[model samples]
Target: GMTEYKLVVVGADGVGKSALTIQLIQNHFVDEYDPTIEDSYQKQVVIDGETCLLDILDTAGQEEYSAMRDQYMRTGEGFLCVFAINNTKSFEDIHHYREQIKRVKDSEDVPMVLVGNKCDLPSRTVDTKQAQDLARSYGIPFIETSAKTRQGVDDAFYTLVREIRKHKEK
Candidate 1:
């Protein structure tokens, strides 16, 4: 039997949320910040010897779209909490997003992955140790990804799928 995983990407504005989603879904990097309100993408792939369908909801990170967060958050089975490695504010925003997801889902043990995007940038503002420490505290997987260079892009999404599966079995 095939399984469907409803995944969401959340982060502060310009933290490369769409870039990471598009890189995984479309196999290319989008360099522009087009300000996504809400978008959905679907893909089918085999992970861990099982066929799975990924229904990804890419939501707006702008303040204007804050009202829509809970609506989509309620439907997601797993989330990729993204932050840019070079942006300190984006890194700080990860905590709010994670807390909101837990609040919306009403469960502290929700499936999630902490993603550090833009890892290929020359200047690093958020230390890898800081991000790893945060994920460790959250008890979630942490991955560094470069959407431009296609580094760890697949792992980020695939890891979320694995998390969703683990959540389902429990």
Candidate 2:
């Protein structure tokens, strides 16, 4: 049997949701980051060797999108709360985003993975300790990945799936 799961990709604009999704799904990146207009979404990837359809709610960073982000959160089994490894502000959103998702989950715990994207960039200066602290606080595994170099990208997703499966078993 093919167990279908919905994975939602949520992040502020420019956090590399599309790029990460494309890289994970298509195994490649587009030439540039040309984001589409309102509610621009598509089926994103596979997980746990299953066709885990993605309902990516790529909200606009320049506008109000908490509602849209929450909507996608409600429709999914899990989420990849993406942040930029080079952007401290994006990383700072991890707590708020996690709390927001908790509010929408209707349950005590929601399966999630904290993804630190853009690890391939050499100019990044965000402290590694900060990311580690957040991951520890959430009680979930974490990995820093780069869509450009494809470093740790698959590992992050697969590890999350493994965690999700473990949770499902219990």
Candidate 3:
């Protein structure tokens, strides 16, 4: 039973959004990137009897993406909000990300997961408490995932699906 759903991997650019998507879905590593304004999408992965048709939209991390944010947030059924732990700036932007998701999705029902990426950087370990707080505040689930190590990535997606199914309106 492959449950079909749209999953959007979003975050400030260079926070490893593409890397995360590519790693999780394709199990490939890309050492360098050239971020461009062009919007790209991928039907990336299948998991837990779910065909996770990911529209891995690598958004421009600029304020200019507000309209595009509104557009995709409106259309997608699920979201995996991502950030890099090595850069606290990306972590701080969680509130802004939460606000934008709520503003565009509007339902409070579409599945959303907060992913703390790049935890593989042992030298840059930040407190996971901050992420937990945001999830608690928003009543969403939180998990830190490192694509390089494949740590917690599975837990992250499956947890969101379980929660979403639990609260879904039949």
Give candidate 3 misplaced runs (Cα > 4 Å).
Answer: 37-40, 44-46, 50-52, 66-69
Extract clashing residue pairs from model 3.
none
Estimate TM-scores for all models.
0.94, 0.81, 0.81
Q: Candidate 1 or 2, higher TM-score?
A: 1
Alpha-carbon RMSD to native, per candidate:
1.5, 2.8, 2.6
Tell me the tens digit of each residue's lDDT in model 1 across 29-120: 88985785567789888888888899888878446645556777887899999999999999998889898799889788999999999999
Tens digits of per-residue lDDT for model 2 on 81-155?
Answer: 889988888877777778777888897667788888898787785767777788788887778888887888778
Candidate 1 off by > 4 Å: 65-68
Candidate 2 residue-wise lDDT at 51: 62
Q: Which lDDT values do the candidates have, in the order given?
A: 0.88, 0.71, 0.71
How far in Å is the alpha carbon of 76 misplaced in model 2?
A: 1.3
- Name the weakest run of 10 consecutive residues (lDDT summed) in model 2: 53-62
Give the alpha carbon lDDT tens digit for every residue of 1-170 in model 3: 45545556777777777776667566676656566543646654556666665555556655675676667668866778888888888888877877777788767666788899888897675578978888787778888988777788767666666766665665
Rank the models by lDDT, top first. 1, 3, 2
Best by lDDT: 1
lDDT of candidate 1 at residue 167, scale 0 to 100: 88
